[PDB]
Design a protein around this motif. Structure first.
Motif, short mmCIF file in Angstrom:
data_model
loop_
_atom_site.label_atom_id
_atom_site.label_comp_id
_atom_site.label_asym_id
_atom_site.label_seq_id
_atom_site.Cartn_x
_atom_site.Cartn_y
_atom_site.Cartn_z
N UNK A 1 87.25 4.95 37.25
CA UNK A 1 88.45 4.71 38.11
C UNK A 1 88.15 3.65 39.18
N UNK A 2 86.87 3.29 39.37
CA UNK A 2 86.40 2.39 40.44
C UNK A 2 85.81 3.18 41.60
N UNK B 1 91.15 -10.88 44.37
CA UNK B 1 90.38 -10.39 45.54
C UNK B 1 89.78 -9.01 45.25
N UNK B 2 90.50 -8.15 44.52
CA UNK B 2 90.03 -6.79 44.11
C UNK B 2 88.98 -6.89 42.99
N UNK B 3 88.97 -8.00 42.24
CA UNK B 3 87.97 -8.31 41.20
C UNK B 3 88.54 -8.30 39.78
N UNK B 4 89.86 -8.50 39.63
CA UNK B 4 90.56 -8.62 38.32
C UNK B 4 90.41 -10.06 37.82
N UNK B 5 89.93 -10.25 36.58
CA UNK B 5 89.86 -11.56 35.89
C UNK B 5 91.27 -11.91 35.40
N UNK B 6 92.05 -12.62 36.23
CA UNK B 6 93.50 -12.92 36.01
C UNK B 6 93.70 -13.94 34.88
N UNK B 7 92.66 -14.70 34.52
CA UNK B 7 92.71 -15.72 33.43
C UNK B 7 92.92 -15.05 32.06
N UNK C 1 89.67 14.21 46.19
CA UNK C 1 88.81 13.04 46.46
C UNK C 1 89.32 12.31 47.71
N UNK C 2 88.42 11.95 48.63
CA UNK C 2 88.73 11.21 49.89
C UNK C 2 87.89 9.93 49.93
N UNK C 3 88.52 8.79 50.25
CA UNK C 3 87.86 7.46 50.31
C UNK C 3 88.68 6.47 51.15
N UNK C 4 88.09 5.29 51.42
CA UNK C 4 88.68 4.19 52.24
C UNK C 4 89.07 3.01 51.35
N UNK D 1 88.00 -1.39 47.11
CA UNK D 1 87.50 0.01 47.28
C UNK D 1 86.10 -0.05 47.89
N UNK D 2 85.75 0.94 48.73
CA UNK D 2 84.49 1.00 49.51
C UNK D 2 83.54 2.00 48.84
N UNK D 3 82.86 1.61 47.75
CA UNK D 3 82.02 2.52 46.92
C UNK D 3 80.67 2.80 47.61
N UNK D 4 80.23 1.95 48.55
CA UNK D 4 79.06 2.21 49.43
C UNK D 4 79.42 3.29 50.46
#
Ligand SMILES: Nc1ncnc2c1ncn2[C@@H]1O[C@H](COP(=O)(O)OP(=O)(O)OP(O)(O)=S)[C@@H](O)[C@H]1O
Ligand SMILES: Nc1ncnc2c1ncn2[C@@H]1O[C@H](COP(=O)(O)OP(=O)(O)OP(O)(O)=S)[C@@H](O)[C@H]1O
Ligand SMILES: [Mg+2]
Ligand SMILES: [Mg+2]
Lengths: 333, 300
Positions: free
Chosen positions: B9-10, B73-79, B225-228, B235-238
């Motif tokens: 899910x990321x 910016x989120x990291x999607x390869x739009x090409x 699940x709780x996240x920032x 998404x802040x996986x660190x």
């Protein structure tokens, strides 16, 4: 070897969809130039900075809401005026039945070319919006008050009769239809909305808006405007100190705010913003209540400093050009 | 064939909450919530994580509100991210079936089920009544897709908007749009809510988010699940890697002071997550520990 019939089945499925439902039904998002974000000016430089992308997005829905006499109508006439100066056509759906055309002229709107409508029902108002959006000939539509969009059954019925959810349902059906058409014609739609209180609330803000929840979802920008003070020339109240909060943004980061003056008759004080932004970016030096540019002393107090920038069109153009260069995230020219 | 395959899910905190370690491929997923909860951001995080594993993805934008710059910016390869902007609700579901049948795409996302307008309602007038046409169209689509999706091994994610029931005394007055057909056919159902702000003193730079699993056919439901979500960056996986590290007593927190392996890392979470960024070694080995302790079934 096996990953190649994957690419074949993709290209075959793309060919099938693109000839069934027309040329550009499916594309790749990086290649689609109809999905890019074009913008137009709000008539406030500070608000153009707060929105991030340098103005309000074309082909999208925008909501402006606030308390009474907070500047909602005035702000939307300033965006119509700015778009007319760039050779665009504009419409104004006045559901409130309270537009003064002489005041619109004083704010700088071309009254002879603005299309105006005063509809009898909310269904009529949203059917005119759809007809103008599909035409491809109109660039900016403003609907003055969601709150005054009353369904036909409520007009025909008696005062006291319950029609719970009916206005909210009408709005929910209208958004579904409009969102597609507006994007296709590259037409900006602005809804003005009023504030109501929710009764029996201990937790959170008691403030809400009218016409249900659909508009909150479909809107790409939502602006909260408030009158935070008076502008005085001695004892005469001559205008209003105004704050705008970007409560929702889908084209840039939200929760930024903008502060400016609305002067009765003139509208938004442009040069007033130019000073405050010039001071912030160290282009204008402030020695207590003394403003100076490059050592040359421009005035005593903000009003005199603004009056000086008015009688120096070259110096104001220079500062504008630099403030624009610095604070605009991605300047497009 | 009936052995289940999952994709990330990321968010690691949500991957644990589902139990199986992601959303199941060849199934239908529903993701609902209120205004600005982070529904679109979460589905672009999935597409990003998926197409890093050599997968093809599609986005059916019925909302008419996808920004290709934010996607990047989120990291999607739009090409090589497939995008459609359909005019009617029927077009959107026929494109979903045609992509599913082909066996070429692995992930499809339909933004707003609320915006899937039937043909009859579009060429009609505003005020005209079309009772349940949206629900029938969805019910027809679900029974036709469910079979085609499974043998293709294609994941279909529906995003839904919340509406409110009039004159209800019992239960919760919140609803979802597009009938109750999707409710049955959906394997997983997420409920995202914005539960607070993330500030840099005063400057608001993010959203404190909470995801609830209200339905799960793959594992035990009713887990959180709780996240920032940071505005840009993604998404802040660190930020999760610390919060799960401290929950399993590998990390220590003494008020505002952090410490791992005796040696202290920073003060606050913002400096603690900033040191994890600068230390890929410990960030690698803590991921190892959090995964191998809270993995349900290690694949390999
Ligand atoms: N025709 C006018 N002449 C002088 N001042 C005006 C005129 N119309 C509006 N204003 C002033 O400009 C300020 C903002 O007014 P508006 O733009 O009308 O605000 P608004 O929020 O649309 O208020 P509503 O619709 O009445 S609740 C107020 O102080 C008004 O009195
Ligand atoms: N292009 C962007 N740049 C910066 N921030 C954004 C952008 N788009 C969205 N955001 C913010 O990220 C957060 C989550 O946004 P989304 O993922 O669009 O949530 P959402 O539930 O899809 O909202 P909707 O579709 O309008 S009901 C919000 O606080 C947004 O303001
Ligand atoms: Mg007004
Ligand atoms: Mg969304």
């Amino acid at each position: 070897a096996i990953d190649e019939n994957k690419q074949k089945a993709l290209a075959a499925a793309l060919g099938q969809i693109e000839k069934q439902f027309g040329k550009g039904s499916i594309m790749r998002l990086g290649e689609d130039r109809s999905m890019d974000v074009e913008t137009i000016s709000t008539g406030s430089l500070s608000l153009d900075i707060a929105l991030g992308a340098g103005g309000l997005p074309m082909g999208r829905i925008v909501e402006i809401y606030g308390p009474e006499s907070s500047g909602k109508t005035t702000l939307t006439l300033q965006v119509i005026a700015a778009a007319q100066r760039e050779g665009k056509t504009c419409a104004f759906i006045d559901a409130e039945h309270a537009l003064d055309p002489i005041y619109a002229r004083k704010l700088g709107v071309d009254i002879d070319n603005l299309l105006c409508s005063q509809p009898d029902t909310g269904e009529q108002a949203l059917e005119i919006c759809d007809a103008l959006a599909r035409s491809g000939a109109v660039d900016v539509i403003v609907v003055d008050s969601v709150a005054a969009l009353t369904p036909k059954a409520e007009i025909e019925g008696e005062i006291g009769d319950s029609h719970m959810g009916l206005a909210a349902r009408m709005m929910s059906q209208a958004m579904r239809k409009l969102a597609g058409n507006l994007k296709q014609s590259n037409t900006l739609l602005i809804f003005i909305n009023q504030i109501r209180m929710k009764i029996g609330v201990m937790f959170g803000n008691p403030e809400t808006t009218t016409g249900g929840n659909a508009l909150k979802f479909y809107a790409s920008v939502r602006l909260d405007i408030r009158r935070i003070g008076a502008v005085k020339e001695g004892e005469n109240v001559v205008g209003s100190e105004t704050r705008v909060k970007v409560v929702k943004n889908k084209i840039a980061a939200p929760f930024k705010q903008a502060e400016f003056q609305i002067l009765y008759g003139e509208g938004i004080n442009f040069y007033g913003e130019l000073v405050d932004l010039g001071v912030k970016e160290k282009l204008i030096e402030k020695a207590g209540a003394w403003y100076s540019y490059k050592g040359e002393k421009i005035g005593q107090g903000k009003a005199n400093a603004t009056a000086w920038l008015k009688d120096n069109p070259e110096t104001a153009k220079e500062i504008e050009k630099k403030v624009r260069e610095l604070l605009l995230s991605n300047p497009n020219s």
